[PDB]
């Protein structure tokens, strides 16, 4: 089925790879070459996750195997394997799922580019999705490579990856003092504030008080000038929201990338360059 | 800023994230800066005991005259090499105790013998010599006194925290955990043993004092928290490393050193050895470890000096 | 290549807009508006005017008192030395009262200033809430902003007031300071047995991540259709245009379903609001109901188990 | 006394009940445009089966327009509009191919709905988007070049015409369109700022969307001093068709 | 010494904003002084005068 | 030593903004000075003078 | 020895902005120097000179 | 140089003056701060005498 206004946009072409071969929809989904390619990566990765849950860390007969949703964990190899492929039951399964995940993500983004070409719209969304992919690849590719072992990746488990985050963080004693981490968090918080402000404002002028007509661009600008003496503007709030969300992802990737590869001591002690300036 | 790649070590199970990272070039230079002085040649272990040859030997009674001389040579290089034998001895009278350095040194011998014989749960067979702390200086470089912190006006009580302090590795956590925990014996545990509320009165500020002590410990050993903990459950011994057990005994060892060996010497120590509160320079993890997981990278010096053990 | 509509290349100017006229009872606005060229590169160049009645005047007075009490105490903690105040600024703080005072008003020299800053900041925020409410009322707009603001105020109140009162001690509230409030954040997780295992912490993270996901998606979606006037969301909502059609089809073809130009702002509203609702609930339950979140997760069967490769003898057992 | 049920567990379950209720609320709101779906199931059923999925559509809300502009309802019954294209294959899920010259087909990225034939208005009730000829209180911000008199080039660098005016938003001051006096036919056509790059030192506006000769067929304004919503969509959509249609290479694929 | 044309201040400063700012300033000042004095030896609520009511029970 | 045309400053500086700024600055300065004095040995509230009022 | 045409500085720099800036700068500097002096041995408030007024009551 | 005066045909005299004033005030603050952080400190050096000692 199609949205009642959709048929007049379902045009042939705009593919990057594949042309007419895969140029079709399946229900709502556009497929194309990267839909097929992404589907294979995705279905394989998910089924290898279920297979990893089925055999557990030490075989399906041990007390450690579990289908409990919180406890399932597929883990990377020991650091001793370095940049080599571990045996499937010793972290190699995690490594293959990682390659599947990256391919699924990147194929998803290129499918999005083909959709933009069909619709004649800007490429902001696949560009923005690339920042999330970049952060994932810093976590499983750039940072592990710089330290010399794929085993620095995080495990694929709903709660087990929180244990990874905790223990990597406290390797630096007090990870809160990571300067790129402070900046990234500031962007995450500011983004959430900005999103609630934006959502609120659009809903409050299109759903005004009873008896009122729909409000105007002049109301939107007046409302925040009245509260903070400034209005960024209806176009610019979307510029701002995109800037804050991408900055949050970017400084995230930076903050984990420097943790190990470019800094090994506690994070509070980094700030000693400031304390030690010959000014005070 | 540092450059990749770092040195790495896996501590816990794969994916749990218990890993250590270090700078390779700083490690190599630290190893050079933590060299142990080569042991003296073995001495003649025969003849009369020092207990029956000398006039006022109260601790090293059972050494032969040769081993006793060798011990005196060794402590001179370890403690007062620039000054020599008479840093601890009245000129022309070796038996005299009329110099404060000799009285202090006598108790220092008992400290080391107690550590090497009675505290192996901490120092194992590696043990300690005078060198471990003094490093060739009469005053150990990494002794400590109670820290008063920055000045406040008279109408505002100091908080003991919120200040950039090397002692807690530049966090704004309570910056003197040494006095309450490595001298006095305040409770370090705050984590509950039951899921539900009802039986744990420990406080968030106690958590911060404990966190401050743990920053100091980590910095003193040059390690991260996962050297001893799985940080998903800091309290859970079953998920901790064997280094945590060792560290537990080391805290009690340090308390014993400060309470029973350093503090009772306060009256004979000069005013130059005391902090603004009148307390003597004394011992923390840093004093021996000096930012290394084992003092001197674990060099076994004490085993070659029989006088550094009890009986 | 194409124009990405990130920066305005050519700004235009018009006489400053004084704002939509307000009903009788509102005070006249104040300030002579100015224009910033550099703000005009990314957004609106006009700064001002501003509204300021009794609610906001009282809010700002309470808030400046609170802020000045904090800064004063920071400077006093380095003995008035302005150079050391700049050196240690991120470390300095205004500290909650000692535990011995419980919830009683503590002495000026040891916690009274914290209690006054918390009181006056709280009144300042509550009055700011009334301000956001009144400013929507005077324009004839609905109260979506004040409802979301109330959800954030709920979380703030739980952190510094509700939980400390429930737990019987101002010493359990949050210090005013940069690095000190980060110490407090980490110490709270330590004290309560690892906040990762608090299920409302997990939800708050899902919604904080989701807020950045959704603003990246929506921000980028709207700029990609700004070539069709899609940033003018009021008239795209009343009079669906090819901006709104292409936006919805981009997402339907990508992930199988889509929303509307109006209803994406409802998804965004709830995602952001649920971030602080779940955050308040999570802290509200810590110490009062659950003393150790990890053991609560063990009890309910959630905590992963690992092969034992390190373990330690308990010297309290030995 | 010990119990498995505890207040944290109670509260998290209460949250799930609320959250799933919220999702169903939101999915209903999501269906106020575009539903019921155009399917081949409704065709063969003679219209008997309306495809709406789950949850079902909400009851209509009303938008009351200012200045006595009327009432908009959502959801609403919208009339089918013929598609100027033929399916590339008869199989379901296949794309369609525009009839005639693609630029002019009103199909694909050239497509757009028929918005209302009246102008967006300022709060005071004047036409919102107007040329600087009409809104004489507007000026170019000092520091920025005046686009008037710049030469407009198409995707292949050929001269399409000159900028004859600038169309501004009177509600929120900004350029929304450039007015281009087209060399080929001397008509004045709108050019959205969204499709315009400034080459400031050369005083050139570059338009990647279409060729210079394509400017001859940019849709025209009924009234030279204002623009209706309807005309805004027809203008912007015509440029966007060029993104896919203006050259052969733009069809893809790369490989 | 006051001034006979002091009344002309209301030709200079807006009477409504002056009134609003005085009300606001005095509310904050009143709350601030009570809290400052309650944080000192002068506290009249926790002074056990005339008696301690927590000791009666 | 003063100047005879000093009144002309009000041809230069707006009387309204000057008056407002003066009273805002003086009120803040007075808050600040009382805070400084209260934080020192000169504190007159917690000095137990003429007596301490906190009974046991 | 300053120049005779130095008054022409008020043809270049705005007398209003200059007067406001000097006033603002001088106030901040005054606050800063008092604080710097109070942070040192020169402190005249907590020096208990002439007497300690807290000692009277404690 | 004889033609150095032409620099005022290139650089706005007003902005150069303001920038010179702003930079010199900041530099002056910076250098006093730096010098006070060291052994040369003349305020906290108990010279000619310690006034806190006087009060004891
Ligand atoms: C249930 C969905 C299925 C329903 C159904 O019958 O579908 C049949 C339907 C066909 O039915 P039809 O006859 O056309 O009828 C029209 C439909 O009824 C049209 O009906 P409709 O318009 O109602 O259909 C929409 C439907 C159909 O859409 C889809 O088909 C895809 C749906 C994917 C669902 C993804 C859910 C993700 C959830 C993650 C788990 C987390 C949950 C939250 C946890 C806490 C978070 C805080 O999607 C949904 O109903 C669910 C959408 C909402 C889920 C939102 C999740 C929220 C999570 C929280 C986010 C933060 C909250 C902020 C506050 O669709 C298909 O057959 C799809 C075919 C499969 C194609 C696969 C190949 C694609 C190749 C390219 C991609 C490669 C990869
Ligand atoms: C003791 C533990 C430490 C700590 C240890 C660390 C460590 C270690 C890390 C962080 C990272 C982060 N921390 Mg921290 N951190 C702590 C406390 C905090 C606090 C707080 C309130 O105290 C906050 C706000 C933060 C905030 C942050 C963010 C800046 C960052 C996580 C966002 C991110 O990476 O986005 C980027 C987003 C992604 C990587 C997601 C990628 C998504 C991909 C592309 C798509 C997936 C699709 C999916 C499979 C689809 C499924 C389909 C459905 C099934 C249908 N931390 C403490 C003090 N922190 C992390 C980071 O920066 O990572 C880069 C990180 O590694
Ligand atoms: C031991 C250290 C000394 C001390 C050494 C000095 C020295 C030295 C000086 C001051 C100066 C000042 N000191 Mg002090 N000062 C001490 C303790 C105090 C205490 C206190 C609570 O203890 C207070 C509140 C003051 C307050 C003051 C201000 C009155 C004055 C700076 C005003 C300014 O910056 O104008 C900036 C504003 C402008 C430039 C705008 C134009 C000025 C307007 C038109 C006039 C405003 C009123 C004027 C300053 C009145 C001054 C009268 C008396 C001389 C005080 N001092 C002690 C006892 N103090 C300075 C001063 O006297 O300046 C004359 C100064 O040189
Ligand atoms: C959906 C959850 C998120 C959220 C929502 C939210 N926050 C909100 C709102 C909403 C919906 C508001 O409506 C409200 C707001 O007004 O935002 C624009 C607010 C707000 N969120 C704020 C901050 C904030 N929100 C945060 C978080 C969040 N807000 C979430 C992540 C954070 C974090 C992450 O820590 C902070 C730091 C403020 C910007 C604003 C509330 C402002 C307020 O209460 O002000 C009164 C308090 C004062 C201290 C007033 C002080 C006055 C100033 C110092 C100005 C001084 C003026 C003076 C006259 C100057 C004179 C000097 C002369 C020399 C000229
Ligand atoms: C950069 C700013 C933020 C951002 C933006 C962003 N994300 C995006 C987009 C954009 C602009 C999309 O267009 C795209 C999308 O289509 O959204 C609807 C996407 C998306 N962001 C998503 C998720 C998401 N984004 C997140 C974050 C962020 N995305 C940022 C903070 C996170 C966090 C923070 O954790 C997650 C969970 C998806 C909804 C969607 C991408 C969907 C996709 O790629 O589908 C293909 C893949 C599958 C269907 C599943 C693949 C399965 C794998 C093959 C196996 C699983 C391996 C995995 C590594 C295991 C992980 C296990 C544990 C960690 C639990
Ligand atoms: C049940 C089942 C099949 C089990 C079998 C499992 C096995 C073995 C295999 C299945 C796995 C395989 C092979 C494929 C599954 C993948 C498929 C086909 C679909 C899943 C797609 C997918 C990633 C869905 C995730 C959707 C989620 C949760 C997104 C999070 C972001 C989010 C909350 C979006 C909701 C709001 C939306 C829709 C925003 C988009 C949106 C935005 C942002 C606007 O700005 C805008 C402006 C104007 C108009 C409309 C819009 C608009 O729609
Ligand atoms: C920067 C300051 C801009 C400014 O100060 O602009 C002033 C106006 O302020 C006004 O309206 C009020 C301007 C106050 C707003 C300043 C910016 C507020 C912060 C905006 C960002 C949002 C806050 C964060 C939200 C998450 C200038 O006007 P006046 O002071 O009246 O004097 C001008 C005289 O010539 C009158 O003849
Ligand atoms: C732990 C326990 C759970 C915690 C959850 C806490 C949730 C509340 C905290 C957040 C407060 C929000 C305040 C604003 C609300 C608001 O604004 O709603 C009003 C607006 C509508 O306004 P409008 O724009 O249409 O017009 C404005 C003109 N007046 O939006 C909504 O109708 C959203 C719809 C409400 C959500 C429905 C949820 C139903 C759950 C049913 C569960 C059934 C299970 C049964 C099991 C037996
Ligand atoms: C010298 O400084 C001057 C004067 C120049 C001005 C400078 C000021 C500066 C530099 C200030 C800097 C401030 C900073 C850096 C602040 C950082 C603050 C942070 C990070 C705060 C974070 C969290 C704090 C929280 C959440 C606190 C909450 C406290 C609450 C909610 C308390 C409420 C208390 C109440 C309602 C009390 C009621 C009193 C009752 C009624 C109980 O009395 C009996
Ligand atoms: C301080 C660190 C010392 C230095 C340096 C040297 N000696 Fe020592 N000596 C020291 C102590 C604490 C003691 C008493 C030991 C005990 O068991 O009670 C001594 C004792 C001697 C003696 C015995 C004197 C006697 O009682 O008859 C002798 C002969 C002696 N020391 C010699 C000696 C020499 C030759 C040294 C330099 C190489 C020397 N000592 C250094 C502490 C310290
Ligand atoms: C709103 C929540 C109401 C909570 C009332 C708590 C009253 C104080 C109780 C504190 N305590 C620990 C002494 O019981
Ligand atoms: C929606 C919130 C419902 C909360 C119900 C809990 C009421 C009593 C809570 C006190 C602690 C209860 N319990 C079982 C954990 O001890
Ligand atoms: Ca009383
Ligand atoms: Ca008194
Ligand atoms: Fe929007
Ligand atoms: Mg603290």
From TrEMBL, chain A:
Binding site for ubiquinone-8 3: 198, 231-233
Keywords: Bacteriochlorophyll, Chlorophyll, Chromophore, Electron transport, Iron, Magnesium, Membrane, Metal-binding, Photosynthesis, Reaction center, Transmembrane, Transmembrane helix, Transport
Signal peptide: none
Annotated binding of bacteriochlorophyll a 4, by residue: 176, 181, 255
Binding site for bacteriochlorophyll a 2: 161
Keyword Transmembrane helix: yes
Pfam families on file: Photo_RC (PF00124)
Transmembrane segments: 29-53, 92-110, 122-142, 182-205, 240-263
One Gene Ontology cellular component: endomembrane system
Entries under InterPro entries matching the protein: Photo_II_D1/D2_sf, Photo_RC_L, Photo_RC_L/M, Photo_RC_L/M_CS
Amino acids binding ubiquinone-8 2: 198, 231-233
NCBIfam families referenced in this protein's UniProt entry, alphabetically: pufL
Record function comment: The reaction center is a membrane-bound complex that mediates the initial photochemical event in the electron transfer process of photosynthesis.
Protein name: Reaction center protein L chain
Organism: Thermochromatium tepidum
Record gene name: pufL
Automatic annotation (TrEMBL), chain C:
Alphabetized InterPro entries for the sequence: Photo_II_D1/D2_sf (IPR036854), Photo_RC_L/M (IPR000484), Photo_RC_L/M_CS (IPR055265), Photo_RC_M (IPR005781)
Signal peptide: none
Predominant localisation class: membrane
Positions annotated to bind Ca(2+): 95
GO CC list: endomembrane system; plasma membrane light-harvesting complex; plasma membrane-derived chromatophore membrane
The keyword Transmembrane appears for this protein: yes
This protein's UniProt keywords: Bacteriochlorophyll, Calcium, Chlorophyll, Chromophore, Electron transport, Iron, Magnesium, Membrane, Metal-binding, Photosynthesis, Reaction center, Transmembrane, Transmembrane helix, Transport
Residue numbers binding bacteriochlorophyll a 3: 181
Binding annotation for bacteriochlorophyll a 1: 196, 201
Pfam families for this protein: Photo_RC
Residues that bind bacteriochlorophyll a 4: 196, 201
Record has Electron transport as a keyword: yes
Compartment(s) where it occurs, according to its Swiss-Prot or TrEMBL record: Cellular chromatophore membrane; Endomembrane system
UniProt binding sites for bacteriopheophytin a: 128
GO molecular function, one term: metal ion binding
Top-rank lineage group of the source organism: Bacteria
Transmembrane regions: 50-76, 113-133, 145-166, 200-223, 267-290
Binding site for bacteriochlorophyll a 2: 196, 201
An example Gene Ontology biological process: photosynthetic electron transport in photosystem II
Bilayer topology: Multi-pass membrane protein
Assembly and interaction partners: Reaction center is composed of four bacteriochlorophylls, two bacteriopheophytins, two ubiquinones, one iron, and highly hydrophobic polypeptide chains.
Function field: The reaction center is a membrane-bound complex that mediates the initial photochemical event in the electron transfer process of photosynthesis.
Annotated family: Belongs to the reaction center PufL/M/PsbA/D family.
Protein name: Reaction center protein M chain
Gene name of the encoded protein: pufM
UniProtKB/TrEMBL annotation, chain D:
GO cellular component: plasma membrane light-harvesting complex
Keyword Transmembrane helix: yes
Record carries keyword Membrane: yes
Domain Photosynthetic reaction centre H subunit N-terminal, first and last residues per copy: 1-134
Assigned keywords, A-Z: Membrane, Transmembrane, Transmembrane helix
Record-annotated PRC-barrel domain positions: 144-212
Transmembrane segments: 8-26
Highest taxon listed in the record's lineage: Bacteria
GO terms under biological process: photosynthesis, light reaction
Protein name: Photosynthetic reaction center H subunit
Gene source species: Thermochromatium tepidum (Chromatium tepidum)
Lineage: Bacteria, Pseudomonadati, Pseudomonadota, Gammaproteobacteria, Chromatiales
Gene label: puhA
Automatic annotation (TrEMBL), chain G:
Residues at which bacteriochlorophyll a 1 binds: 34, 44
Binding site for bacteriochlorophyll a 6: 34, 44
Subcellular localization(s) per the UniProt record: Cell membrane
A Pfam family annotated for this UniProt entry: LHC
Name of the protein in question: LH1 alpha polypeptide
PROSITE patterns per UniProt: ANTENNA_COMP_ALPHA
GO cellular component, one term: plasma membrane
Organism expressing this protein natively: Thermochromatium tepidum (Chromatium tepidum)
GO MF annotations, alphabetized: bacteriochlorophyll binding; metal ion binding
Swiss-Prot/TrEMBL keywords: Antenna complex, Bacteriochlorophyll, Calcium, Cell membrane, Chlorophyll, Chromophore, Light-harvesting polypeptide, Magnesium, Membrane, Metal-binding, Transmembrane, Transmembrane helix
Principal subcellular localisation of the protein: membrane
Segments forming domain Antenna complex alpha/beta subunit: 7-45
